[PDB]
Amino acid sequence: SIIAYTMSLGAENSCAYSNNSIAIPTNFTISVTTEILPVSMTKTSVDCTMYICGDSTECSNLLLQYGSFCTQLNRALTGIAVEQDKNTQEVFAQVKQIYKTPPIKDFGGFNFSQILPDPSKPSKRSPIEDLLFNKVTLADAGFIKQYGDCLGDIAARDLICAQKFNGLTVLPPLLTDEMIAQYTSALLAGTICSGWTFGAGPALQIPFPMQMAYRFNGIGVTQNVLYENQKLIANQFNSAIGKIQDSLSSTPSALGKLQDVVNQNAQALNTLVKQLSSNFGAISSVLNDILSRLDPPEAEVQIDRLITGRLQSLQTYVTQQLIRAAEIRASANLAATKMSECVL
Amino acid sequence: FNGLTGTGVLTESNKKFLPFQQFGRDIADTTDAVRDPQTLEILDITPCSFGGVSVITPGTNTSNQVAVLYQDVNCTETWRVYSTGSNVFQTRAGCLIGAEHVNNSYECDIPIGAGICASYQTSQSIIAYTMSLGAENSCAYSNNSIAIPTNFTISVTTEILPVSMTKTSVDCT
Amino acid sequence: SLSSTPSALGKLQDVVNQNAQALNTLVKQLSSNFGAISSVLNDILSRLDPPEAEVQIDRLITGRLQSLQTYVTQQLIRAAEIRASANLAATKMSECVLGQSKRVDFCGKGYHLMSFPQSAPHGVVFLHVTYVPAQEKNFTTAPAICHDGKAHFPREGVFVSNGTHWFVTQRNFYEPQIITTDNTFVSGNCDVVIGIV
Amino acid sequence: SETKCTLKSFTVEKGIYQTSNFRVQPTESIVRFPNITNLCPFGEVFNATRFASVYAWNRKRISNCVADYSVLYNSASFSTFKCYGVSPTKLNDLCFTN
Ligand SMILES: *[C@@H]1O[C@H](CO)[C@@H](O[C@@H]2O[C@H](CO)[C@@H](O)[C@H](O)[C@H]2NC(C)=O)[C@H](O)[C@H]1NC(C)=O
Ligand SMILES: *[C@@H]1O[C@H](CO)[C@@H](O[C@@H]2O[C@H](CO)[C@@H](O)[C@H](O)[C@H]2NC(C)=O)[C@H](O)[C@H]1NC(C)=O
Ligand SMILES: *[C@@H]1O[C@H](CO)[C@@H](O[C@@H]2O[C@H](CO)[C@@H](O)[C@H](O)[C@H]2NC(C)=O)[C@H](O)[C@H]1NC(C)=O
Ligand SMILES: *[C@@H]1O[C@H](CO)[C@@H](O[C@@H]2O[C@H](CO)[C@@H](O)[C@H](O)[C@H]2NC(C)=O)[C@H](O)[C@H]1NC(C)=O
Ligand SMILES: *[C@@H]1O[C@H](CO)[C@@H](O[C@@H]2O[C@H](CO)[C@@H](O)[C@H](O)[C@H]2NC(C)=O)[C@H](O)[C@H]1NC(C)=O
Ligand SMILES: *[C@@H]1O[C@H](CO)[C@@H](O)[C@H](O)[C@H]1NC(C)=O
Ligand SMILES: *[C@@H]1O[C@H](CO)[C@@H](O)[C@H](O)[C@H]1NC(C)=O
Ligand SMILES: *[C@@H]1O[C@H](CO)[C@@H](O)[C@H](O)[C@H]1NC(C)=O
Ligand SMILES: *[C@@H]1O[C@H](CO)[C@@H](O)[C@H](O)[C@H]1NC(C)=O
Numbered sequence A: 001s002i003i004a005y006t007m008s009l010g011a012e013n014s015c016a017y018s019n020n021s022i023a024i025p026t027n028f029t030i031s032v033t034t035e036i037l038p039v040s041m042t043k044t045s046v047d048c049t050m051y052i053c054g055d056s057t058e059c060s061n062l063l064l065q066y067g068s069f070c071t072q073l074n075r076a077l078t079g080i081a082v083e084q085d086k087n088t089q090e091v092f093a094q095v096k097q098i099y100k101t102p103p104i105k106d107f108g109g110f111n112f113s114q115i116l117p118d119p120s121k122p123s124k125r126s127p128i129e130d131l132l133f134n135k136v137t138l139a140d141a142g143f144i145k146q147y148g149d150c151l152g153d154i155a156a157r158d159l160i161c162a163q164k165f166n167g168l169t170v171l172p173p174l175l176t177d178e179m180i181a182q183y184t185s186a187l188l189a190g191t192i193c194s195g196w197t198f199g200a201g202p203a204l205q206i207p208f209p210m211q212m213a214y215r216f217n218g219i220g221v222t223q224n225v226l227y228e229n230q231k232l233i234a235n236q237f238n239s240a241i242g243k244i245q246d247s248l249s250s251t252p253s254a255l256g257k258l259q260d261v262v263n264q265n266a267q268a269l270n271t272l273v274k275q276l277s278s279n280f281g282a283i284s285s286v287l288n289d290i291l292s293r294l295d296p297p298e299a300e301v302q303i304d305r306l307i308t309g310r311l312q313s314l315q316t317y318v319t320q321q322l323i324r325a326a327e328i329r330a331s332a333n334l335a336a337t338k339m340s341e342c343v344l
Numbered sequence B: 001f002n003g004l005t006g007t008g009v010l011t012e013s014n015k016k017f018l019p020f021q022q023f024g025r026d027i028a029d030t031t032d033a034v035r036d037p038q039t040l041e042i043l044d045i046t047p048c049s050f051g052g053v054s055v056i057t058p059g060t061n062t063s064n065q066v067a068v069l070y071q072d073v074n075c076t077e078t079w080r081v082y083s084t085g086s087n088v089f090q091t092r093a094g095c096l097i098g099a100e101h102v103n104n105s106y107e108c109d110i111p112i113g114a115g116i117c118a119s120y121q122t123s124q125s126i127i128a129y130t131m132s133l134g135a136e137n138s139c140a141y142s143n144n145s146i147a148i149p150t151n152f153t154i155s156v157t158t159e160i161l162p163v164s165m166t167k168t169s170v171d172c173t
Numbered sequence C: 001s002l003s004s005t006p007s008a009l010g011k012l013q014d015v016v017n018q019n020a021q022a023l024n025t026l027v028k029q030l031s032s033n034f035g036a037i038s039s040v041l042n043d044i045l046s047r048l049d050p051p052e053a054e055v056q057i058d059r060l061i062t063g064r065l066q067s068l069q070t071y072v073t074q075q076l077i078r079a080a081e082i083r084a085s086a087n088l089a090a091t092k093m094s095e096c097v098l099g100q101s102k103r104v105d106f107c108g109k110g111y112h113l114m115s116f117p118q119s120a121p122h123g124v125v126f127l128h129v130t131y132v133p134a135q136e137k138n139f140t141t142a143p144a145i146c147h148d149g150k151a152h153f154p155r156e157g158v159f160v161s162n163g164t165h166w167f168v169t170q171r172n173f174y175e176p177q178i179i180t181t182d183n184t185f186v187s188g189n190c191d192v193v194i195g196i197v
Numbered sequence D: 001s002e003t004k005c006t007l008k009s010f011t012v013e014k015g016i017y018q019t020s021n022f023r024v025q026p027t028e029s030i031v032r033f034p035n036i037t038n039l040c041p042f043g044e045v046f047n048a049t050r051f052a053s054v055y056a057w058n059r060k061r062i063s064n065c066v067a068d069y070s071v072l073y074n075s076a077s078f079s080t081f082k083c084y085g086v087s088p089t090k091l092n093d094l095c096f097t098n
Helices: A048-052 A057-091 A127-133 A159-165 A177-194 A208-219 A223-228 A230-250 A256-275 A287-293 A296-343 C010-029 C041-047 C050-097 D002-006 D042-046 D088-093
Strands: A043-046 A097-099 A168-171 B009-012 B023-025 B031-035 B042-046 B053-057 B067-070 B088-091 B094-097 B100-106 B110-113 B116-121 B125-131 B135-137 B145-149 B152-162 C111-120 C123-133 C136-141 C150-154 C158-161 C166-170 C173-177 C184-189 D015-018
Touching: A043 A057, A043 A296, A048 A057, A048 A296, A057 A296, A057 C010, A057 C050, A097 A177, A127 A177, A127 A230, A159 A168, A159 A256, A168 A256, A208 A223, A223 A230, A223 C150, A223 C184, A256 A296, A287 A296, A287 D088, A296 C050, B053 D002, B110 D015, B145 C158, B145 C173, B152 C010, B152 C050, C010 C050, C010 C123, C041 C050, C050 C111, C050 C123
Parallel strands: A097 B135, B100 B125
Antiparallel strands: A043 A168, B009 B042, B023 B031, B031 B042, B053 B067, B053 D015, B067 B094, B088 B094, B110 B116, B116 B125, B145 C136, B152 C123, C111 C123, C136 C158, C150 C184, C158 C166, C166 C173
């Protein structure tokens, strides 16, 4: 059955207040957690003329009476597309040196084989990165569709064909997946070989256990703890990474935020496609029926009604797309801050 | 077709209409197929083009040469191309015509997409190339060796932020 | 650098240009017909009677009102971007100018020393002064010293060695010191730490 | 020139400008209708000897014929010819089902 209940805010606990007693840790653990941030969203361009008018000269001539609105919407979408690449570079373009991955994958007991790229795969991705790419589902199998295939009837009614026919164009990103993986790999090699020195400027080699010793000193724990228990620490680190790989592989919703971004843009474009079919008060949703059955002045009245309908639809889409773009910009700025502040 | 007009490409359809159904319509409420009124064949109708054209232009105060990118044209596999003139370079972003293809990576100037960029270079022409992400470098991993700075420099850099914008009031009447 | 480069302040010019274009867009949109017989209100009033003028005027009113609403929405979104920028600028003012922050790249590339804000048209320009490592040398290291069987760790800095002698240096600057009991602490013994010299 | 026109400028800055689409134009007009050869019975409708009383009006179906309204121009003068579903000038371009 369906059960209704009062929510539990959390487990109850207590801590004694004793003016002559303290608690002190005697042991410790290395914990590995994840953080997920959107960086970019699909770049979309819309041909407002093809969308509004079905290659109708009369419709086009009427559209010219509102042409600056069509141009303005195109400009707003272009600006959004430009911002997506700016955001991508700001998150992933802080280091202008590409460091080679060392041939060694195990440094002082710390196993990075699941973090560093696997050179034997077509995609220079780590097993964890490969899992990340195998969880988010993208409807667009690349950016080139061509005119063929879509020429005939698609039994599945593949949405990309319909969207492109109505003037909705999906643009490629400026940076490819290989370029991003290469950049990230360079950052991992940078930190592993030189700690944080490569962020501030030149990369100074430091043995990995000494980078950890400095990090412990930063925590407020003597270097002795790391050197005394180095093997235990390395074992906990390696186990924590294995746990991350299993956690990501096991949970289908681990990357839900990114799927939600993709789904929101897919729904917005399917919404425009469905809204194209509305009558908007006209005798027919199809422009060719109006032109075929009505004379010029009556066709112009019904066409003007359809033009108003479609133009309002596009403006609504652009406004919502721009607000989502603003949310992506805020997310990208946070991601870039985390990159510089937490990684470097 | 029997009073239903339009522009498109006719093909044989794989659909079968019920004995009383004359027309097929898409999710957009547009015609996707028609049963021909003269011979009872089922035909599909598809729009004639996807477009997808952008022009790569250097500033007009230097040169009037341009190159055109066709986003949905596969120039390697007519071709929905306005004009050619050789200099055909296919990319994941579509094929472009008019720029030279140079395999010497370089700094990006005018971005194209999917790893490709272009710039205007001197015998002047528009050059298309793969972007260079950065200089390659390396750092040795040595468990018994460190590097230590022996000298230092004072560096001064700038940061620019908007604070305000022009305040505008509009009398809507 | 500022005098030489015409684009040094491009972000501020872009803000000004966006608002100028938005207002020129409203001026140009005023001229659209919007489906009416004429873009000029006086022609409609002069040639048409009340009820026909009212129909054409209503069409123009809808056109202009939609134009203004579009402008206001876009202006408000740009205002939101300016607010985000201003909040970042205020944070940088308090955190980089009135103090010294440890955040990497927050106050410019390198290690932050100090900053000097300057005013600018519709904005602020910060001059950040940072400490940057320069010439460097390759030295041998070790995590610990085994003097008498006890494990000796540095109180600060790193153990560095030239070809023949061991010293203690600062991680950010090479001033070799003699290893002594006043800059070294003892904990544990020589049988646990790997690579003890 | 297309870019210059789009930006309302005779100077174009360095960059990429999107400028409409490459469109294929039709090369021929293909018209298909059923092969109907009979003329519609306009004589029976307009040259009838007698019309039914309005209280008991008649209706009949017309099918399998070609409609042509120019035949009436030299037959009778009509006081009313008002079409609501279709403009009169487009009547010859349509085909009707009931
Ligand atoms: C430290 O002492 C506190 C008491 O001051 C312990 O807290 C008590 O723990 C018992 C269970 O062992 C509970 O039944 C009591 O109710 C707790 N009393 C409190 C919080 O006032 C605490 O467990 C001790 N911790 C350690 C690590 O020894
Ligand atoms: C470092 O981790 C990798 C896994 O990321 C280890 O390689 C695995 O080794 C086990 C045997 O111990 C094999 O069964 C797995 O199939 C291997 N996996 C992969 C992906 O190669 C590697 O042995 C670890 N190295 C060290 C030194 O601990
Ligand atoms: C501190 O905690 C660690 C685990 O976080 C303990 O190490 C494990 O101890 C169990 C016995 O209880 C062994 O079976 C495991 O093999 C140990 N793990 C590793 C990686 O060595 C450790 O014993 C605890 N006590 C300390 C450090 O004093
Ligand atoms: C420190 O030593 C490394 C080697 O461990 C030097 O890096 C080498 O530099 C030479 C040029 O002098 C290159 O040809 C090698 O390929 C580099 N090898 C690497 C990175 O493994 C480094 O230059 C030395 N630095 C200083 C300041 O002496
Ligand atoms: C490492 O540094 C030490 C200390 O400067 C050098 O040893 C000194 O060398 C000078 C001559 O340059 C002598 O006068 C001192 O008496 C030496 N000091 C000691 C404690 O022996 C040493 O030569 C340097 N080693 C290398 C390989 O450069
Ligand atoms: C063109 O088609 C071929 C064959 O499907 C494909 O391999 C290629 O990637 C496509 N596009 C380009 C730009 O080469
Ligand atoms: C350092 O690494 C080398 C392998 O390159 C190894 O032989 C040596 O024992 C290691 N030394 C220490 C102190 O870890
Ligand atoms: C006329 O149309 C009918 C119905 O489709 C068809 O069977 C017949 O063959 C056609 N005849 C001619 C002469 O086109
Ligand atoms: C009606 O009869 C006249 C001759 O009196 C003829 O000219 C006309 O065409 C006929 N009308 C029709 C609709 O056949």
